[PDB]
Amino acid sequence: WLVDLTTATQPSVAVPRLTHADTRGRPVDGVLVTTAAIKQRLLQSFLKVEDTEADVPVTYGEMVLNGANLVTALVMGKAVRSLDDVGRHLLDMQEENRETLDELESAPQTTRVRADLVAIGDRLVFLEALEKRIYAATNVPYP
Amino acid sequence: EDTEADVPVTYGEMVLNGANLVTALVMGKAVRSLDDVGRHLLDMQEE
Amino acid sequence: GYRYAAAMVPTGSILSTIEVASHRRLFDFFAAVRSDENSLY
Amino acid sequence: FTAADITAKHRCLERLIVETGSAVSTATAASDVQFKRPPGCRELVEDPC
Amino acid sequence: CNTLSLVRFLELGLSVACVCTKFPELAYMNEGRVQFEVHQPLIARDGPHPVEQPVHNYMTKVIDRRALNAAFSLATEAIALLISLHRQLRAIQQLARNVQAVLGAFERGTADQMLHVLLEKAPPLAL
Numbered sequence: 311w312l313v314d315l316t317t318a319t320q321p322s323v324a325v326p327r328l329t330h331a332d333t334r335g336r337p338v339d340g341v342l343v344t345t346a347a348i349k350q351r352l353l354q355s356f357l358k359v360e361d362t363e364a365d366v367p368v369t370y371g372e373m374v375l376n377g378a379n380l381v382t383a384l385v386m387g388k389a390v391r392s393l394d395d396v397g398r399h400l401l402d403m404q405e406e407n408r409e410t411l412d413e414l415e416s417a418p419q420t421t422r423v424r425a426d427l428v429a430i431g432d433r434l435v436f437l438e439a440l441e442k443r444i445y446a447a448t449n450v451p452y453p
Numbered sequence: 454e455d456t457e458a459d460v461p462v463t464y465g466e467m468v469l470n471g472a473n474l475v476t477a478l479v480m481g482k483a484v485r486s487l488d489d490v491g492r493h494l495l496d497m498q499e500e
Numbered sequence: 501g502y503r504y505a506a507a508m509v510p511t512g513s514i515l516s517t518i519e520v521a522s523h524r525r526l527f528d529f530f531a532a533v534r535s536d537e538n539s540l541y
Numbered sequence: 542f543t544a545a546d547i548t549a550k551h552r553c554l555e556r557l558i559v560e561t562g563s564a565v566s567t568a569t570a571a572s573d574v575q576f577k578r579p580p581g582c583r584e585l586v587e588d589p590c
Numbered sequence: 591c592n593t594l595s596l597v598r599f600l601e602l603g604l605s606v607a608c609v610c611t612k613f614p615e616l617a618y619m620n621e622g623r624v625q626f627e628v629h630q631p632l633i634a635r636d637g638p639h640p641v642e643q644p645v646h647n648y649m650t651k652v653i654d655r656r657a658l659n660a661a662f663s664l665a666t667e668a669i670a671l672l673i674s675l676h677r678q679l680r681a682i683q684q685l686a687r688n689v690q691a692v693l694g695a696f697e698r699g700t701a702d703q704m705l706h707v708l709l710e711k712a713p714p715l716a717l
Contacts, residue, residue, distance in 0.1 A: 385482055393480070
């Protein structure tokens with residue numbers, strides 16, 4: 311059953327920015343947020359561990375309305391995400407879609423966090439339970 | 454009569470070249486003389 | 501996707517490859533197109 | 542027993558199953574009996590019935 | 591007449607991982623469009639069958655907003671005075687950490703905003 315929580319869902323699109331990879335190797339493609347009780351009895355006697363992976367601490371990039379946007383922003387009311395390249399490239403193909411410069415620029419700095427990965431058959435799936443982490447001790451219910 | 458002699462000029466123009474393209478085929482608004490405005494929109498906020 | 505000249509740079513992974521729009525049709529705009537259509541140009 | 546409400550639903554399957562993940566019940570988990578749902582509150586039930 | 595009136599707290603790291611993308615700086619904005627262009631390929635079927643055209647798919651999506659909310663925390667006379675600055679501003683330094691506490695109110699409710707809409711896009715598994 312627990313493989314079928316995975317692998318019945320289609321992936322959407324990749325980005326070379328989002329580097330969620332295991333320590334020295336394999337990338338991550340799952341999340342699986344459960345409660346602490348269900349996290350407990352599952353990994354105790356059903357699954358395996360390959361923990362403490364490497365992900366980005368830097369929060370993901372920046373969109374600013376700079377001179378490419380800002381001119382188009384107030385004067386016409388038009389806004390284009392990253393008008394720099396898609397203005398440049400579409401000026402150059404004018405002098406001779408497939409826009410593969412969606413997001414692959416720098417691959418910013420990663421660090422090392424306490425992360426729990428499991429091997430659900432094929433996939434390297436992340437798994438964390440979070441009540442004591444960020445839902446603890448408030449008047450907000452857990453989802 | 455002042456004279457019978459005149460000094461006119463020749464045409465002017467504007468063609469979608471620099472970023473006016475990008476603001477037309479991705480955005481909708483295409484500012485006439487954009488780049489002189491677009492720089493100065495990045496110039497006024499530091500005065 | 502709506503602005504087609506924006507999608508000339510895909511800037512991301514078309515990655516799932518599952519039968520689109522036989523799913524939830526949750527999209528605010530989507531067009532199931534054959535090989536060509538005049539509105540593309 | 543409602544002639545309108547079952548007839549009011551659509552039938553495109555893509556939107557059918559995802560409403561089951563978050564539907565609004567007619568019940569209330571903040572009352573001593575099943576008081577019919579107060580018009581200002583949300584419930585976020587599952588409800589396959 | 592005793593100390594130990596102190597607890598500490600922060601929450602990051604996984605606070606970017608599940609989020610799984612980010613655009614910062616939304617300005618004064620009205621509509622956000624993202625359009626999708628996919629191409630279902632065809633298979634040359636043989637014989638007395640209808641001819642499968644090269645098909646095309648173009649759709650658009652729109653954003654939602656769902657803005658978040660923040661707490662109010664300010665009494666009187668901390669903004670004024672009556673000079674005891676290592677105590678009078680240490681009330682304000684603790685008040686600044688109260689602002690740092692409601693800075694935690696953005697990192698924590700971040701995942702809450704996801705797990706609202708993450709259950710929204712989910713059918714039951716047996717369906």
